[PDB]
Amino acid sequence: SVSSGQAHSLTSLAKTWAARDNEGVLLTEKLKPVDAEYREEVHWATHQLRLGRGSFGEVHRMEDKQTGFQCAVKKVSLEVFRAEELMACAGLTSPRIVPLYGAVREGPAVNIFMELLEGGSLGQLVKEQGCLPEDRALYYLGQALEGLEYLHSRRILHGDVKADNVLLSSDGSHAALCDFGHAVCLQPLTGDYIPGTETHMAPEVVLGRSCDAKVDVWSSCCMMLHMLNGCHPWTQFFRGPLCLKIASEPPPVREIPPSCAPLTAQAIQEGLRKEPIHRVSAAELGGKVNRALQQVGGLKSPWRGEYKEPRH
């Protein structure tokens, strides 16, 4: 059956789902079961207009019929369901990670319920604006790294850090990490891995070497270059596949715009060190990014300003 409760009940129940009628745990007052049940189109209803596409399923705006509260729902098949989806975001203290409202299995699918962020993704903002000004880029990279810092401290690796997996609030002030389908647990180094976006992959993952929290740091600076240039790393210079180039070529520091401040350029360099032992952690890179943001003048640029042309 489907009960109200707390994160540990959901995670241990997530292990039984990932190991393989209506069961789960709702972690918030907004979503309420009726007679210990919670079923699609019966106790809650999906909206027709889709929110987007996740890694292992489409994301929809839903609405609880009793309470009237709306949330995001990602339907993931049991055949591709990973317990790390919920363990990466269940009961987290950080505001820079999209909070889990609950997870409920209904037959062959698992319905993951998450808080709505109405501002769209950072990827959509970059597509619309063309590219973001330096202070806006630093600001969002700073908040992404606060989220990563917190995840890494809890032995969780995101595994697909990019603009599409960073949601924004309506006013652009708050940013948070979403989509934990590539999430991996860390031991006192990584375990089993699902591949993220090729352009954001660290050299250690392509070389087949042992990976750790520093993979998300590499990806976060690839996301920084994307924000600044309007295009992913590598793609202006090479055509796919990129794995042999990522392994052999120098890190894409040449894609740092020359307009950038000293501390911004230096921050991107330390985050894009090829050897993960030489590469800064999330917490360390976050410090550099905050200091670089202060150097440039803080967050001055307007929320959805003019269209800056991407690099060609």
The residues annotated with a catalytic role in the active site are 160
Residues 25, 87, 148, 167: which binds ligand PZ4 (CB under 6 A)? 167
Residues 184-213 that bind ligand PZ4 (CB under 6 A): none
86 binds ligand PZ4 (CB under 6 A): no
**x-or-dash string of contact with ligand PZ4, 92-131, rule CB under 6 A:** ------x---------------xxxx--------------
Distance between CA atoms of 206 and 185, rounded to whole angstroms? 19
Distance between CA atoms of 36 and 104, rounded to whole angstroms? 11
74 binds ligand PZ4 (CB under 6 A): yes
Residue ranges of E strands in 98-180: 100-106, 109-114, 156-157, 166-168, 175-177
- Least distance CB 164 / ligand PZ4 (angstroms): 7
CB-wise, 54 or 203, nearer to ligand PZ4? 54
54 binds ligand PZ4 (CB under 6 A): yes
Distance between CA atoms of 271 and 218, rounded to whole angstroms? 6
Q: How many Cα atoms occupy the beta-carbon half-sphere of 111 within 13 Å? A: 26
Distance between CA atoms of 159 and 200, rounded to whole angstroms? 10
Q: How many Cα atoms occupy the beta-carbon half-sphere of 139 within 13 Å? A: 19
217 binds ligand PZ4 (CB under 6 A): no
Residues 106, 134, 160, 179: which binds ligand PZ4 (CB under 6 A)? 179
Distance between CA atoms of 257 and 138, rounded to whole angstroms? 13
166 binds ligand PZ4 (CB under 6 A): no
| Binding site residues, ligand PZ4, CB under 6 A | 51-55, 59, 72, 74, 98, 114-117, 167, 178-179
